[PDB]
């Protein structure tokens, strides 16, 4: 029959790596072939694409983050434990959209606010509240996702009364260079970022708990599951298979060592026994 499915990703290192892992698992364990589609746009493009579907210029599968789905359902930022976010998005996406959340990959790739270790020492910074008290001295460099999202800087700034001198919208790798060069003093480091542990940076504590959990999980259209039921068990072979530290190392293989993400994804799966060498 030569059935195919479309796995989507937006264009950032982690997104492409885990989208490739999903594609590799499908091709290794089923007779399906995978179209890998890269979407330009923000944190909602894949959601609209999966509502369209791989037959109608959209996608069938992608890896979403629980807290993003949660804040989208609620219409305002909230905090909850990982189970609260996951169970809520799973039930709501099943009822409202016939989209099935599969099991979490294992890591929480949350937004953070991060500063240079030297700045944190010179002002004894530990928490977001500490940082807010001096924010009028500082420049924030942040991803477009962070500066535009309701779960991003808008709500955070309201809750903590952040008063940064200004914000600079920056590509993902650019913001690490910018904080290194002191063009900015704070960035929205993401917890799994490959460059993070390699730049002498301090992740500050979200002491008022503004951010939701951001656990990555594959999600799939129900009608694709209906046509190809094996996909459920196949994709759940990834359940809890990627820790925060493992994801960081894969991201660094791409962003720091220059390996291509397809190779990084496939080699990780082979080394962990999740696919076999052909
Ligand atoms: C994963 N983040 C929450 C850090 C943003 C991208 O969706």
Coordinates of C-alpha atoms and ligand atoms in Angstrom, one line a residue:
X1 CA 0.0 0.0 0.0
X2 CA 3.0 2.2 0.7
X3 CA 1.3 4.3 3.4
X4 CA 3.2 7.3 4.7
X5 CA 2.9 9.7 7.7
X6 CA 4.1 13.2 8.1
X7 CA 6.2 14.1 11.1
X8 CA 6.5 17.8 11.7
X9 CA 9.0 20.0 13.6
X10 CA 9.7 23.7 13.9
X11 CA 13.3 24.6 13.1
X12 CA 15.4 24.4 16.3
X13 CA 18.0 21.9 17.3
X14 CA 16.0 19.8 19.9
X15 CA 12.8 19.9 17.8
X16 CA 14.6 18.5 14.8
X17 CA 16.5 15.8 16.8
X18 CA 13.3 14.4 18.5
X19 CA 11.3 14.7 15.3
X20 CA 14.0 12.6 13.6
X21 CA 13.9 10.1 16.5
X22 CA 10.1 9.7 15.9
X23 CA 10.7 9.2 12.2
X24 CA 13.5 6.7 12.8
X25 CA 11.3 4.7 15.2
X26 CA 8.4 4.6 12.7
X27 CA 10.6 3.5 9.9
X28 CA 12.5 0.9 12.0
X29 CA 9.5 -0.8 13.6
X30 CA 6.7 -0.4 11.0
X31 CA 6.3 -0.7 7.2
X32 CA 5.4 3.1 7.1
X33 CA 7.5 5.7 5.4
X34 CA 7.9 9.1 6.9
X35 CA 7.9 12.6 5.4
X36 CA 9.9 15.0 7.5
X37 CA 8.3 18.4 7.3
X38 CA 9.9 21.6 8.8
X39 CA 7.5 24.3 9.7
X40 CA 8.5 28.0 9.9
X41 CA 6.7 29.9 12.6
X42 CA 6.1 29.8 16.3
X43 CA 5.0 27.4 19.1
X44 CA 1.5 27.0 17.6
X45 CA 2.3 26.2 13.9
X46 CA 2.6 22.4 14.6
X47 CA -0.7 22.4 16.5
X48 CA -2.6 23.9 13.5
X49 CA -0.7 21.6 11.1
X50 CA -1.7 18.5 13.1
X51 CA -5.3 19.7 13.0
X52 CA -4.9 19.8 9.2
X53 CA -3.3 16.4 8.9
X54 CA -0.7 14.9 6.5
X55 CA -3.2 14.5 3.8
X56 CA -4.2 18.2 3.8
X57 CA -0.9 20.1 3.7
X58 CA -0.4 19.4 7.5
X59 CA 1.2 16.9 9.7
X60 CA 0.2 13.7 11.5
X61 CA 2.7 13.6 14.4
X62 CA 4.9 16.0 16.3
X63 CA 6.5 16.4 19.7
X64 CA 4.7 18.9 21.9
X65 CA 5.4 20.3 25.3
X66 CA 2.8 19.7 28.0
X67 CA 2.9 23.2 29.5
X68 CA 2.4 24.8 26.1
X69 CA -0.7 22.8 25.6
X70 CA -1.9 23.6 29.1
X71 CA -1.5 27.3 28.8
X72 CA -3.3 27.2 25.4
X73 CA -6.2 25.3 26.9
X74 CA -6.5 27.6 29.9
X75 CA -6.0 30.9 28.2
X76 CA -3.7 32.1 30.9
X77 CA -0.4 30.9 32.5
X78 CA -0.8 28.5 35.4
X79 CA 1.4 26.3 37.5
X80 CA 0.8 22.7 38.3
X81 CA 2.8 19.5 38.8
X82 CA 3.9 17.5 35.7
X83 CA 1.1 15.0 36.1
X84 CA -1.5 17.8 36.2
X85 CA -0.3 19.3 33.0
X86 CA 0.1 16.0 31.2
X87 CA -3.3 14.5 32.2
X88 CA -5.1 17.7 31.4
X89 CA -3.7 18.2 28.0
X90 CA -4.1 14.5 27.1
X91 CA -7.8 14.4 28.1
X92 CA -8.6 17.8 26.5
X93 CA -6.8 17.1 23.2
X94 CA -8.5 13.7 23.0
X95 CA -12.0 15.3 23.5
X96 CA -11.7 18.5 21.6
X97 CA -9.4 17.6 18.7
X98 CA -9.1 13.8 18.6
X99 CA -5.4 14.2 19.2
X100 CA -3.7 11.5 21.3
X101 CA -0.8 12.4 23.6
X102 CA 1.6 9.5 23.8
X103 CA 4.0 9.0 26.7
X104 CA 6.6 11.7 27.7
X105 CA 10.1 11.3 26.3
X106 CA 11.6 12.0 29.8
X107 CA 12.8 15.6 29.9
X108 CA 11.3 19.0 30.9
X109 CA 12.6 21.6 28.5
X110 CA 11.4 24.7 30.4
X111 CA 12.1 28.3 29.8
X112 CA 14.5 29.8 32.4
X113 CA 16.0 33.1 33.1
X114 CA 19.8 32.7 33.1
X115 CA 22.7 35.0 33.9
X116 CA 26.5 34.9 34.0
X117 CA 27.8 33.2 37.1
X118 CA 29.8 36.4 37.7
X119 CA 26.7 38.5 37.7
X120 CA 25.0 36.1 40.1
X121 CA 27.9 36.2 42.4
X122 CA 28.3 40.0 42.3
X123 CA 24.6 40.5 43.2
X124 CA 23.9 37.2 45.1
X125 CA 21.2 36.2 42.6
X126 CA 19.3 33.0 43.3
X127 CA 15.7 33.6 42.2
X128 CA 13.7 35.5 39.7
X129 CA 12.6 37.8 42.5
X130 CA 16.2 38.6 43.2
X131 CA 16.8 39.4 39.5
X132 CA 13.7 41.6 39.3
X133 CA 15.0 43.8 42.0
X134 CA 18.0 44.8 39.7
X135 CA 16.3 44.2 36.4
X136 CA 16.3 48.0 35.5
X137 CA 20.1 47.7 35.2
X138 CA 20.0 44.8 32.8
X139 CA 19.2 43.9 29.2
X140 CA 17.3 40.7 28.3
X141 CA 18.2 38.8 25.2
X142 CA 15.5 36.3 24.4
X143 CA 14.1 34.0 21.7
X144 CA 11.1 35.2 19.6
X145 CA 9.1 32.4 21.2
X146 CA 9.8 33.7 24.7
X147 CA 9.0 37.3 23.8
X148 CA 5.8 36.6 22.0
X149 CA 4.2 33.7 24.0
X150 CA 1.6 34.2 26.7
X151 CA 3.5 31.6 28.7
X152 CA 6.6 33.7 28.0
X153 CA 7.9 37.2 28.9
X154 CA 4.5 39.0 28.9
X155 CA 3.1 37.0 31.8
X156 CA 6.4 36.6 33.6
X157 CA 7.1 40.4 33.5
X158 CA 3.6 41.1 34.9
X159 CA 3.9 38.6 37.7
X160 CA 7.4 39.6 38.9
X161 CA 7.4 43.3 37.8
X162 CA 10.5 42.8 35.7
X163 CA 11.9 46.2 34.5
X164 CA 14.6 45.2 32.1
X165 CA 16.2 48.2 30.3
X166 CA 15.0 46.6 27.0
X167 CA 14.7 43.2 25.3
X168 CA 16.5 42.0 22.2
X169 CA 14.9 39.3 20.1
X170 CA 17.6 36.9 19.1
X171 CA 18.1 33.6 17.3
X172 CA 18.7 30.7 19.6
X173 CA 22.5 30.4 19.3
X174 CA 23.0 34.1 19.0
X175 CA 21.7 34.7 22.5
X176 CA 24.5 32.6 24.0
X177 CA 27.1 34.6 22.1
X178 CA 25.4 37.9 23.1
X179 CA 25.4 37.1 26.8
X180 CA 29.0 35.9 26.5
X181 CA 30.0 39.2 24.9
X182 CA 27.9 41.2 27.5
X183 CA 25.6 42.6 24.8
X184 CA 22.9 41.3 27.1
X185 CA 23.0 40.3 30.8
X186 CA 20.0 37.8 30.9
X187 CA 18.8 35.2 28.4
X188 CA 15.9 32.8 28.3
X189 CA 18.1 29.7 28.3
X190 CA 16.0 26.6 27.7
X191 CA 16.8 23.8 30.2
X192 CA 18.0 21.3 27.6
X193 CA 20.0 23.9 25.5
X194 CA 23.2 22.3 24.2
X195 CA 25.2 25.5 24.8
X196 CA 24.0 26.0 28.4
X197 CA 26.4 24.1 30.6
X198 CA 29.2 25.2 28.3
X199 CA 28.9 29.0 29.0
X200 CA 29.4 29.5 32.7
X201 CA 25.8 30.5 33.3
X202 CA 23.6 30.3 36.4
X203 CA 19.9 29.2 36.0
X204 CA 17.8 31.2 38.4
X205 CA 14.9 29.8 40.4
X206 CA 11.3 30.5 39.3
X207 CA 10.4 31.2 43.0
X208 CA 6.8 32.2 42.4
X209 CA 6.3 29.3 40.0
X210 CA 5.1 31.2 36.9
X211 CA 6.1 28.6 34.3
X212 CA 4.2 25.3 33.8
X213 CA 6.1 22.0 33.2
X214 CA 7.3 21.6 29.7
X215 CA 7.5 17.8 29.2
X216 CA 8.1 16.7 25.6
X217 CA 5.7 14.0 24.3
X218 CA 4.8 12.8 20.8
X219 CA 1.3 13.5 19.9
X220 CA -0.6 11.8 17.0
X221 CA -3.9 12.2 15.1
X222 CA -6.5 9.6 16.2
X223 CA -7.3 8.7 12.6
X224 CA -3.7 7.9 11.9
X225 CA -3.7 5.7 15.0
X226 CA -6.9 4.1 13.6
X227 CA -5.2 3.4 10.3
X228 CA -1.9 2.3 11.9
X229 CA -2.6 1.1 15.5
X230 CA 1.0 -0.3 15.9
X231 CA 2.3 3.3 16.0
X232 CA 1.1 3.7 19.6
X233 CA 3.3 1.0 21.0
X234 CA 6.1 1.9 18.7
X235 CA 6.2 5.5 19.7
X236 CA 5.8 4.6 23.3
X237 CA 9.1 2.8 23.1
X238 CA 10.5 6.3 23.6
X239 CA 8.8 6.7 26.9
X240 CA 11.2 8.0 29.6
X241 CA 14.1 7.2 27.2
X242 CA 15.6 10.8 27.1
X243 CA 16.6 12.4 30.4
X244 CA 17.4 16.1 30.6
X245 CA 21.1 15.3 30.6
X246 CA 20.8 13.0 27.5
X247 CA 18.9 15.6 25.6
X248 CA 21.5 18.3 26.5
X249 CA 24.2 16.1 25.2
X250 CA 22.4 15.4 21.9
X251 CA 21.7 19.1 21.5
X252 CA 25.4 19.9 22.1
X253 CA 26.5 17.3 19.5
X254 CA 24.6 19.4 17.0
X255 CA 25.2 23.0 18.3
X256 CA 28.7 22.6 19.8
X257 CA 30.2 19.8 17.8
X258 CA 28.6 20.4 14.4
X259 CA 27.0 17.0 13.8
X260 CA 23.9 16.8 11.7
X261 CA 20.7 16.1 13.7
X262 CA 19.7 13.1 11.6
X263 CA 23.0 11.3 12.5
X264 CA 22.7 12.3 16.2
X265 CA 19.2 11.0 16.5
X266 CA 19.9 7.7 14.8
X267 CA 23.1 7.1 16.7
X268 CA 21.3 7.8 20.0
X269 CA 18.6 5.3 19.2
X270 CA 21.0 2.6 18.1
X271 CA 23.3 3.0 21.1
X272 CA 20.3 2.7 23.5
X273 CA 18.9 -0.4 21.8
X274 CA 15.8 1.4 20.6
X275 CA 16.5 0.5 16.9
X276 CA 18.6 -2.3 15.5
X277 CA 21.4 -1.9 13.0
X278 CA 20.3 -3.0 9.5
Ligands
LIG1 C1 10.5 24.2 24.8 N1 10.4 25.6 25.2 C2 9.3 25.6 26.2 C3 11.6 26.1 25.9 C4 10.0 26.5 24.1 C5 9.8 25.9 22.7 O1 8.6 25.3 22.7

